[PDB]
Write a protein that binds this DNA or RNA. Structure first.
Lengths: 117, 51, 150
RNA sequence: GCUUGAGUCUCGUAGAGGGGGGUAGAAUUCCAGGUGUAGCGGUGAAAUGCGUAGAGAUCUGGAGGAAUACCGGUGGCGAAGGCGGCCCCCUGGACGAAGACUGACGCUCAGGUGCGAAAGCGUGGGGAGCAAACAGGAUUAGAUACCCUGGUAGUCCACGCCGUAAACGAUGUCGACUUGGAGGUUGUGCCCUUGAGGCGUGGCUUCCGGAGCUAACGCGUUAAGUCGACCGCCUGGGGAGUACGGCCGCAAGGUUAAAACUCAAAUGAAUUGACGGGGGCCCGCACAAGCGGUGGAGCAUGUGGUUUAAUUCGAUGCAACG
């Protein structure tokens, strides 16, 4: 019941899952979505056409205000960097600026050895 | 990476910044590092680029 | 394997003369006793009169409408495991496939006799009933219902 | 005596060469607070784990440590090991050019001295991420592993020690000769320098390759070709870089280095093929698409069993069993 009018939307695009939260201008949570919470779980998610149905769920929780326009914050790789923005363009929302906020360091921390099969 | 356009449309322009960073220098990190594995495979893949 | 020719031109119904109904009787046929097939379906096909009262002709196609799918699965030996990538279904098999469900499920109906056990199914087809109509959604719940892979 | 070897002087050039001290930006983690709400994280799946004591996400502020995307290259510097952000201070070597100077002052070098990746060791600091050990979860016949959730030493700093590596070009240093082609990087001379530019002449360096060399692979002016000077080293495989003794070390352990006995080979490259849970391209009812079966049932038939005085001999993966 605040009517933020316009607020950026963060798209935490990951591999094992993807989640988009339609925060406000300053950066306050107004409504978040989630593939894991979008019916199918396990790992069936991930896929782009699976995240789209997730972020689209926001237009059902963050619609209580009246977002007439909004930007997009895509972070991290994975099947949900495009899908999300698309579903949002159809949901009825607008757009003000697309950008990738993926954490790309300068050889700072030393990543995990991991995987070796 | 900074998009912005007048006349609402979901054209793209987005894959334009997708040529300098993006999912590349990302997966580059992802798993472990490299150390000797790169200086080597980086100097062998170079051989490939000849013909 | 690599062979690429054409389809087998089937002989039309023993009366209405229609390939669509032709392969229909064949799919229904059994033990090469094609005769019985005709005398078993050609009857129930017209017995619709008692079930309606008019030029029972399009009823067949209309009944198949409620049994015409447009999406199926297809496991693929990729990604180490086995995909499922669902895909639609061309017309060539749409009409065909349906006919199977209409018959291959009209036999387990357990009514008076195959001759009639089949007739009723047609009425249940357009009116949605029996496994015949079931198989549709029970199949659609995969394709278009799991596009995550499609 | 001489000057071409070697060296000095001058003036330039490029460089992640070294030692010290600063400093910047991205990211991670953590602490605090705001928004907001039932998931997050992870895998092939899962589970451990974290979440309603409010996570994850998101945003604001703060603390701290490690490493410096892009440039980055088939690149550069160094004796080797190795050396990447920007800035300053102290410092080494390499190269070019007009030249000027010294005058064989050189090459190599057992012993000797010094430098040495990483791991490790001692004292004291530091500690974000990562991660031997260790602990859970999973996989599996088992799984003291690979995978997942955590995580200590350690990785970082100082100072001292240890001296090893597939410390590799598996190719000692120095010098002179010997067809060529394309390229990289850096200096210099010259050319309507009118240009990106064009022609030479030095340094270092890639790839192809001729003669020749080679057991073959291949090396080929940066030689494994043709020669000269000095040094290190090898003499069948196993036993064994082990034992013993010496020396070194805080300790790991290092260095030097056998015998007994045992085998008739151990080995190198290349060839033919077989195979690969290697790659490319193919065909077969091989699969996929369907039609009907076998597997259950009663009976037939054969076989292995079991039995029998005998249950006659044979046939036994697809190729054995109507």
């Amino acid at each position: 019941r605040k009517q933020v009018s316009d607020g950026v939307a963060h798209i935490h695009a990951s591999f094992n899952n993807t989640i988009v939260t339609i925060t406000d201008r300053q950066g306050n949570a107004l409504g978040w979505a989630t593939a894991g919470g979008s019916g199918f779980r396990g790992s069936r998610k991930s896929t782009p056409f699976a995240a789209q149905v997730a972020a689209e769920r926001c237009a059902d929780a963050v619609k209580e205000y009246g977002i007439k326009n909004l930007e997009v914050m895509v972070k991290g790789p994975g099947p949900g960097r495009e899908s999300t923005i698309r579903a949002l363009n159809a949901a009825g929302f607008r757009i003000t600026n697309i950008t990738d906020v993926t954490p790309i360091p300068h050889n700072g921390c030393r990543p995990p050895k991991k995987r070796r099969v | 990476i900074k998009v912005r356009e007048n006349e609402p449309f979901d054209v793209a322009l987005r894959r334009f910044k997708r040529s300098c960073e993006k999912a590349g220098v990302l997966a580059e990190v992802r798993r472990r590092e490299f150390y000797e594995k790169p200086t080597t495979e980086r100097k062998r893949a170079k051989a490939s680029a000849v013909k | 394997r690599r062979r690429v020719i054409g389809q087998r031109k089937i002989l039309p119904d023993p009366k209405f003369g229609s390939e669509l109904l032709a392969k229909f009787v064949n799919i229904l046929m059994v033990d090469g006793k094609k005769s019985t097939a005709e005398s078993i379906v050609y009857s129930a096909l017209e017995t619709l009169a008692q079930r309606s009262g008019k030029s029972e002709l399009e009823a067949f196609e209309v009944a198949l409408e409620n049994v015409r799918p447009t999406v199926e699965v297809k496991s693929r030996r990729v990604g180490g495991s086995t995909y499922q990538v669902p895909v639609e279904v061309r017309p060539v098999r749409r009409n065909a496939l349906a006919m199977r469900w209409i018959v291959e499920a009209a036999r387990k109906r357990g009514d008076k006799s195959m001759a009639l056990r089949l007739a009723n199914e047609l009425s249940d087809a357009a009116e949605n009933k029996g496994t015949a109509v079931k198989k549709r959604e029970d199949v659609h719940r995969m394709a278009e219902a799991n596009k995550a892979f499609a």
